[PDB]
Amino acid sequence: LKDYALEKEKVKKFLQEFYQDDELGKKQFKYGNQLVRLAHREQVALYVDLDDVAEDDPELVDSICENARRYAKLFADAVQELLPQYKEREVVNKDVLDVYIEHRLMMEQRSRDPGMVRSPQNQYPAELMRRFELYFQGPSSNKPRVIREVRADSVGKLVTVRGIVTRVSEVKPKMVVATYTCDQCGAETYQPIQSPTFMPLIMCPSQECQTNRSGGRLYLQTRGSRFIKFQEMKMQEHSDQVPVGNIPRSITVLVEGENTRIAQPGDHVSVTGIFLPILRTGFRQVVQGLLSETYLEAHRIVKMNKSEDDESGAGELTREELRQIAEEDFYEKLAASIAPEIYGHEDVKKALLLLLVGGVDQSPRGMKIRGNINICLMGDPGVAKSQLLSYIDRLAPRSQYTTGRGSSGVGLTAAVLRDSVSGELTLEGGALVLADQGVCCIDEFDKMAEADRTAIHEVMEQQTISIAKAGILTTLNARCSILAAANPAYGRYNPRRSLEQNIQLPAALLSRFDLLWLIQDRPDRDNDLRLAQHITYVHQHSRQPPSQFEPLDMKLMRRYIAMCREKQPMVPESLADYITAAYVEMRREAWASKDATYTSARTLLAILRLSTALARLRMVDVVEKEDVNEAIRLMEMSKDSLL
Amino acid sequence: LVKIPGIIIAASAVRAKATRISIQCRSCRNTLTNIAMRPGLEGYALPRK
Amino acid sequence: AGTVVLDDVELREAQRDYLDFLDDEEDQGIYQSKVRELISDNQYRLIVNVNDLRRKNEKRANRLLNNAFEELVAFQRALKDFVASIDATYAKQYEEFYVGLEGSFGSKHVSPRTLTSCFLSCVVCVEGIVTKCSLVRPKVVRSVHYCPATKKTIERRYSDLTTLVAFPSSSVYPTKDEENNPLETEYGLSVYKDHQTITIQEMPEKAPAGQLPRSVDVILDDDLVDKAKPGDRVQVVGTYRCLPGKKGGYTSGTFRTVLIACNVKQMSKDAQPSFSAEDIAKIKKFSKTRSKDIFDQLAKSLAPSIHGHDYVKKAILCLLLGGVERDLENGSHIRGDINILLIGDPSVAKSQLLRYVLCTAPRAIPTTGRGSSGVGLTAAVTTDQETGERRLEAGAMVLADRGVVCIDEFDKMSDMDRTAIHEVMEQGRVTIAKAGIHARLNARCSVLAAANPVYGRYDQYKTPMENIGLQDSLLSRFDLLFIMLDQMDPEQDREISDHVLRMHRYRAPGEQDGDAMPLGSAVDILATDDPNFSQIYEKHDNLLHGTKKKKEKMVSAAFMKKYIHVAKIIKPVLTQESATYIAEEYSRLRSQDSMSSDTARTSPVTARTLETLIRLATAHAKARMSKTVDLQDAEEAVELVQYAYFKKVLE
DNA sequence: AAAAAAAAAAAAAAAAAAAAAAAAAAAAAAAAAAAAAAAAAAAAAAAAA
Numbered sequence A: 001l002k003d004y005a006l007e008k009e010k011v012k013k014f015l016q017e018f019y020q021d022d023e024l025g026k027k028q029f030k031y032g033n034q035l036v037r038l039a040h041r042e043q044v045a046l047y048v049d050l051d052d053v054a055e056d057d058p059e060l061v062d063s064i065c066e067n068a069r070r071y072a073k074l075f076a077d078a079v080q081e082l083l084p085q086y087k088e089r090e091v092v093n094k095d096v097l098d099v100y101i102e103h104r105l106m107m108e109q110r111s112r113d114p115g116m117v118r119s120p121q122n123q124y125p126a127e128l129m130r131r132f133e134l135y136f137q138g139p140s141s142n143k144p145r146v147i148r149e150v151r152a153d154s155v156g157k158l159v160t161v162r163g164i165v166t167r168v169s170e171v172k173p174k175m176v177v178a179t180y181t182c183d184q185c186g187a188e189t190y191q192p193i194q195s196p197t198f199m200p201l202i203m204c205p206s207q208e209c210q211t212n213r214s215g216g217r218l219y220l221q222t223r224g225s226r227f228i229k230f231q232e233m234k235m236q237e238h239s240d241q242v243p244v245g246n247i248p249r250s251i252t253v254l255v256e257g258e259n260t261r262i263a264q265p266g267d268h269v270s271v272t273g274i275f276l277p278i279l280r281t282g283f284r285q286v287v288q289g290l291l292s293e294t295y296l297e298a299h300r301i302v303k304m305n306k307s308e309d310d311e312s313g314a315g316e317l318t319r320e321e322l323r324q325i326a327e328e329d330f331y332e333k334l335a336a337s338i339a340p341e342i343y344g345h346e347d348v349k350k351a352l353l354l355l356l357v358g359g360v361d362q363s364p365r366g367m368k369i370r371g372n373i374n375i376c377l378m379g380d381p382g383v384a385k386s387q388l389l390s391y392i393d394r395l396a397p398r399s400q401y402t403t404g405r406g407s408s409g410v411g412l413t414a415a416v417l418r419d420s421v422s423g424e425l426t427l428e429g430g431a432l433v434l435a436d437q438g439v440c441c442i443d444e445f446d447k448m449a450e451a452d453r454t455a456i457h458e459v460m461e462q463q464t465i466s467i468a469k470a471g472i473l474t475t476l477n478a479r480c481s482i483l484a485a486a487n488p489a490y491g492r493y494n495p496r497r498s499l500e501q502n503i504q505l506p507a508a509l510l511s512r513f514d515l516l517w518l519i520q521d522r523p524d525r526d527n528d529l530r531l532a533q534h535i536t537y538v539h540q541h542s543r544q545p546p547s548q549f550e551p552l553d554m555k556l557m558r559r560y561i562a563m564c565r566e567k568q569p570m571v572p573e574s575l576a577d578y579i580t581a582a583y584v585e586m587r588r589e590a591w592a593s594k595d596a597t598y599t600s601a602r603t604l605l606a607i608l609r610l611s612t613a614l615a616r617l618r619m620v621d622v623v624e625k626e627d628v629n630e631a632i633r634l635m636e637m638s639k640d641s642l643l
Numbered sequence B: 001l002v003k004i005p006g007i008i009i010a011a012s013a014v015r016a017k018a019t020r021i022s023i024q025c026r027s028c029r030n031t032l033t034n035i036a037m038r039p040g041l042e043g044y045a046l047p048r049k
Numbered sequence C: 001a002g003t004v005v006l007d008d009v010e011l012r013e014a015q016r017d018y019l020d021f022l023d024d025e026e027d028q029g030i031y032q033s034k035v036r037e038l039i040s041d042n043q044y045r046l047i048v049n050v051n052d053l054r055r056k057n058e059k060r061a062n063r064l065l066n067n068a069f070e071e072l073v074a075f076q077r078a079l080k081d082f083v084a085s086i087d088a089t090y091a092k093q094y095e096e097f098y099v100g101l102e103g104s105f106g107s108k109h110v111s112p113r114t115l116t117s118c119f120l121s122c123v124v125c126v127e128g129i130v131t132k133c134s135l136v137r138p139k140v141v142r143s144v145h146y147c148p149a150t151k152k153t154i155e156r157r158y159s160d161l162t163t164l165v166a167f168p169s170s171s172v173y174p175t176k177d178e179e180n181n182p183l184e185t186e187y188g189l190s191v192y193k194d195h196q197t198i199t200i201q202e203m204p205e206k207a208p209a210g211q212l213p214r215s216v217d218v219i220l221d222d223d224l225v226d227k228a229k230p231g232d233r234v235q236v237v238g239t240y241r242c243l244p245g246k247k248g249g250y251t252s253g254t255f256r257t258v259l260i261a262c263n264v265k266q267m268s269k270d271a272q273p274s275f276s277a278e279d280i281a282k283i284k285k286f287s288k289t290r291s292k293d294i295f296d297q298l299a300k301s302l303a304p305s306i307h308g309h310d311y312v313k314k315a316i317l318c319l320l321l322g323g324v325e326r327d328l329e330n331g332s333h334i335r336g337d338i339n340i341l342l343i344g345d346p347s348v349a350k351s352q353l354l355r356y357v358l359c360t361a362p363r364a365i366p367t368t369g370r371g372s373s374g375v376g377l378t379a380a381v382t383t384d385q386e387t388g389e390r391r392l393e394a395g396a397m398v399l400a401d402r403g404v405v406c407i408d409e410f411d412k413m414s415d416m417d418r419t420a421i422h423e424v425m426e427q428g429r430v431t432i433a434k435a436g437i438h439a440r441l442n443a444r445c446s447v448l449a450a451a452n453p454v455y456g457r458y459d460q461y462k463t464p465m466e467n468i469g470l471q472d473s474l475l476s477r478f479d480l481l482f483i484m485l486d487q488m489d490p491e492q493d494r495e496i497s498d499h500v501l502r503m504h505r506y507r508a509p510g511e512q513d514g515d516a517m518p519l520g521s522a523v524d525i526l527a528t529d530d531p532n533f534s535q536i537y538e539k540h541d542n543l544l545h546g547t548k549k550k551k552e553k554m555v556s557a558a559f560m561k562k563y564i565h566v567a568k569i570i571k572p573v574l575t576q577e578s579a580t581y582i583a584e585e586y587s588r589l590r591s592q593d594s595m596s597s598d599t600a601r602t603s604p605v606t607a608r609t610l611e612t613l614i615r616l617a618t619a620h621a622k623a624r625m626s627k628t629v630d631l632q633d634a635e636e637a638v639e640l641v642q643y644a645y646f647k648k649v650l651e
Numbered sequence D: 001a002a003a004a005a006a007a008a009a010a011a012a013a014a015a016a017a018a019a020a021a022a023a024a025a026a027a028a029a030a031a032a033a034a035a036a037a038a039a040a041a042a043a044a045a046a047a048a049a
């Protein structure tokens, strides 16, 4: 229907004279600069934002979104033609593929014969000599689609979907152009690969071996060939977009090139790409017809909404965030912003913020002490333990939420599972691995299987998982902080029994928890009325009642916490005696009493990492005495409910 | 014709076996209808021409 | 050989008959309206009741039920003509308009067991349960290619030869130009329709007991694909056909048969009800005319065969109506589902209340204490075993999403199962994970459970804690707990025995004529239509042997179903007077000194009790169709909670 | 002028090679499916104050 020479001129015109004031208001050619950067081989990926294209040619954006594979090819053609005139120096040949490109180009010039018309097969395939790769960023005027509803009517179209990443293969080399050499001639043979399989060539087709009518067997080699970083992921529907009685649907996303190594399993992502078929020929197909599988050829992969990425590299922000972080009540404001719909539990929220920020990991002369804070909320029924855990799951960047026994066994640990790219046995992690450097919220901790409690022992202290079962012999790597929620021994605290007889945790597991918080709800008229007013306001308006400080948005909380995270403070010597005295005093009162939990050196280490976290929240580089004071006070408030 | 007793220990799903088939030629499209099939576990070799 | 049919007399007559049946404008234009309606909401399949066709043209009806593809292609030509007449632009926007079939199939109503070879090429109705769905695959129906060498663009069409002879020239995908120039396919310009194969098994409760099940393969084409999922009880209407084998040279004479669906439908209990304008007028009249005591009128009319348990019936109405889910901006969730537990003496009609809600409520799932075990109750994770991948399997409480799980003998359920349902009973979701897959399935259900106390019978002289053998964590998420007690009072016995004996004497009018026995046996079911997928409604029941006579009527079951469906959608908003009353009420409930001595707590009072005060008040307001939660609603909620949460211990 | 000749010169029949056309044409191997059974890990219910 349409003429692609004119479309190529259109996309050339867009690339050459589109400008924006992004550089601090200075008017830059957004894509000409990148053509410069990738003509000098300083850049590989060119993300063509289609919002930019739509500013001056919405019909082009419609055509792109309707074919989306013709236009990716057109854009690659156009940029490849524009690169020579944007090259202002000579590339340093940073790579080994670059040497092959340079030798091929130089040989082609050397035997040029510019006026002689060479065969269509006597040329280098375009894909063999590109070194860049071009991707679309979907127009924002396209509303994201739901994985279930991306069907045959959108094959070939550019669509945007979002879901949880459930499974990512390892990055492995996918052949793009298979290069062969001959045993007779000295020409190279190229076989661009489009299918998932290919039959390697046997005889060479070069001009010399045809003239000579020689054998000319050709040999497949990796050295001149083109591979691309390839990776296959499975992405899954979000829970709040599944039909009522249904399970979430998956989609295969084929990720190649510079989009690899972005998504990890557990990530919430938005993927823009072309919905494309794979011919699926070969089977003993029941039905006649050209049936095919489907996949999303990823163009843009964006983590989001709990695993947001770009803010991390954008730590520089407004003067405001400077002024709130500088404020003295910043710690109180961040603590209050944790689940504002839950009323009360101010100190619990302070401790939870400490778990999110965490302490500093020590590595002294090969004896690792982990800076993770593990917290257990040992509480009465209906005191909002699960709500706090679910909130912390929605907040923390790498967080997995686990209730009683749905995620038991290999749902926490790893399992060996078959792959598809290589058909061998890959290792897949469970909740403790999917939360490797984040939080794992274990709800109903007390009703957990004993094997899983043992695994949690070894995770909490050594921060690994040792498996020596039949198919698996590995030490997984689980650097997570455990946020546990449990009920006392008989579902409710019994003041007639002893504290550890209510906790029903062994001393070893009880010591694994830096802060173990008792939450009792004794009735009382004033506090019950206040709690009821808060709850009824939340029901009435879907928001917490207004207070003096507006709670921070969960994006701001993530950014503030992440900005705190890279702030390793050191305990000074001037605090050594103060900390030691606090620990000794705490230790003495532990056995002076008859209603105290197990206390050990881990209690000191808990003081020390809690105070390090508190110092970190103030963005200081040394721990002060107020941090140690706040750590001590939180440690007493953990059991304050007993009084 | 035999008469034997016994107990039945498996019964397959009921399926479809042709008694008459029709075959069509791929080029001239002419048909060779109502070819009678032998009853029982006996097959049929299509005409090669 | 390529010929065209200059004149097919049969095709002409068929198309004329079908267009005549569809025009319908003189005969109260039902299909006229149906076609304009599918044009309106942008569909392209018309569901045609074969009873209407049998009325208008019986000869077509027989021909269509017996020669399915010929008649269906004629009828789809006629339908495209009709759509083009009504709207030519919409008609050109779709290549094909399909006709699905509906209604009563006499002997063409089968199960996967009775679907035999005497039905090949006939339209059949098959009922069963989905055992496996395939992936939804696109099948190319029109491939567009571009030759960069010559700038030419070609297109190649592929007819649906699924059940017809396919010659190998029919399925060649063009890769080269005639000059052997490489073609490249235009994926966004090519046309693909999506394709899916399911397997329908005979329903386990319909199959002969002890025999292995029988299945049928079913083909689903575009817009019919995602209509069923494994474990669904569906009704599939389609053509029964013998699939072509692969070009051989020797054939064994065996053909794979398959059902090519022309319509798929779910259990009609779970479908959106049809609402005639008179029905909406009647609902508005009901709600507006009787507003103070409408809730009690609906409640006492709930399970008419069960005498008494009026508070239990009010609570069950609240469960059927539900609170309103809160969806906070930060993603936090508060449930609007009401969970009810009945503990009682033997034979106090609590299994009967569970069964009534099973009959009445949409998406109600049964279960007994040990009939479901964890994985069978919540979801499961299995491995596909043919692709090597993890697969999620929905259990009872996922299938009951936006529905009810009616758990009976809840006490005899194992402890691990109740631990498993803790998370569903509050968060309305099932968190499940093996290592290759993790998911958070939606299970937004309300649990109605029946249990027996420890020792089988309730002990009046023991604390309800010592008598209900459940812990405060499990009890507290049951937001209403009713001790249904067998008191052997003689006047109560008068009342109950009278009611029961009166229910054991009633004959259904007309159907029963004096001595009839109801049963039918394994053929009579397929003889008539299924009252599970089947397509003037009064308001009050007429007086009969159910009741003697009085000045208070009985809401009809059908009207109550329609009314509850309408009222369930309402989202009454809590007012400030209601909020203050509920807050102070809850604060008073928590403080024990307000409640007498010798009166124990059946279940603990927590913040969940406040949430359930709100939920019950909201459900009451829904019943009145208020759009606001007024003080009467809050009072009814508080009195229900007050009745449920305390029991008098005797001595 | 006609009378023998003595060729064309047309036909029927033959040959007589070409050069093109026409006519013959199942059985052996494989794979996939669906079903089994088996080593291992994992999840249940009987034990006692």
Ligand SMILES: Nc1ncnc2c1ncn2[C@@H]1O[C@H](COP(=O)(O)OP(=O)(O)OP(=O)(O)O)[C@@H](O)[C@H]1O
Residues within 6 Å of the ligand: A341, A342, A343, A344, A379, A380, A381, A382, A383, A384, A385, A386, A387, A388, A486, A487, A531, A535, C333, C334, C335, C426, C473, C607, C608, C611
């Ligand atoms: N302090 C509170 N503020 C706001 N809401 C609360 C509070 N306490 C309880 N709730 C409400 O009560 C409901 C139950 O809370 P949740 O399920 O978190 O209890 P839980 O601590 O998990 O109890 P269990 O130990 O039984 O699991 C939630 O909807 C929550 O909103």
Ligand SMILES: Nc1ncnc2c1ncn2[C@@H]1O[C@H](COP(=O)(O)OP(=O)(O)OP(=O)(O)O)[C@@H](O)[C@H]1O
Residues within 6 Å of the ligand: C305, C306, C307, C308, C344, C345, C346, C347, C348, C349, C350, C351, C352, C353, C450, C451, C452, C496, C499, C500
């Ligand atoms: N109040 C009542 N009104 C009408 N029928 C009743 C009443 N009480 C008992 N029945 C009759 O008793 C019979 C048994 O009732 P059901 O099976 O529901 O008892 P149950 O409470 O479930 O007993 P269990 O607790 O032992 O399971 C039913 O057929 C029911 O009709």
Ligand SMILES: [Mg+2]
Residues within 6 Å of the ligand: A385, A386, A443, A444, A485
């Ligand atoms: Mg909980």
Ligand SMILES: [Mg+2]
Residues within 6 Å of the ligand: C350, C351, C408, C450
């Ligand atoms: Mg019962």
Ligand SMILES: [Zn+2]
Residues within 6 Å of the ligand: A182, A183, A184, A185, A186, A187, A204, A206, A208, A209, A216
């Ligand atoms: Zn060669």
Ligand SMILES: [Zn+2]
Residues within 6 Å of the ligand: B025, B026, B027, B028, B029, B030
């Ligand atoms: Zn032929």
